[PDB]
Design a protein around this ligand. Structure first.
Ligand SMILES: CC(=O)N[C@@H]1[C@@H](O)[C@H](O[C@@H]2O[C@H](CO)[C@@H](O[C@@H]3O[C@H](CO)[C@@H](O[C@@H]4O[C@H](CO)[C@@H](O)[C@H](O)[C@H]4NC(C)=O)[C@H](O)[C@H]3NC(C)=O)[C@H](O)[C@H]2NC(C)=O)[C@@H](CO)O[C@H]1O
Length: 129
């Protein structure tokens, strides 16, 4: 599923991400936009053999199991395929653990380089929330 900007914002809000760990909703929508262009099915391979999955490009090196990332962790306790669902619950639940692991949203490289320090509030303009 390719979410619309405001549709995503609402699903994210619903799932408790607005201000999760002090990160306003515009942060999460901006991260999604640049990580996967709002596509739940996005997948990208890393040079170490690990793979990033879904709307928030969660890395199999640490957060999910894809049975093809030798000696990696499965911190969210889920198969990586669960992160490609049209339903973002798994993605959001796992994101919540990631953001609290010490580095905040710096865990998301697109967030750090394209969202961090910008006017993220623009990402939720005109949405009924
Ligand atoms: C090609 C490319 O760069 N692809 C991107 C993917 O790398 C990227 O996924 C992110 O990958 C980084 C590097 O593996 C990963 O960051 C690591 O995350 C762990 C887990 O939290 C950190 O370890 C913790 O460190 C803190 C602070 O030191 C400790 O207190 C804590 O105990 C540690 N946790 C554990 C379990 O040991 C690492 O410090 C950190 N490594 C680096 C180099 O920063 C991110 O978690 C990955 N992000 C996500 C969302 O999965 C992917 C996603 O945007 O983007 C690809 O393009």
């Amino acid at each position: 599923k390719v979410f619309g900007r405001c549709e995503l914002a609402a699903a994210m809000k619903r799932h408790g991400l607005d201000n999760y760990r002090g990160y306003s909703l515009g942060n999460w929508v901006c991260a999604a936009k640049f990580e996967s262009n709002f596509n739940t099915q996005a997948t990208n391979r890393n040079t170490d053999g690990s793979t990033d999955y879904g709307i928030l490009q969660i890395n199999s090196r640490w957060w999910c199991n894809d049975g093809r990332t030798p000696g990696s962790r499965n911190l969210c306790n889920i198969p990586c395929s669960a992160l490609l669902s049209s339903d973002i619950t798994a993605s959001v639940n796992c994101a919540k653990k990631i953001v609290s692991d010490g580095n905040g949203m710096n865990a998301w490289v697109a967030w750090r380089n394209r969202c961090k320090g910008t006017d993220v509030q623009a990402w939720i303009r005109g949405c009924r929330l």
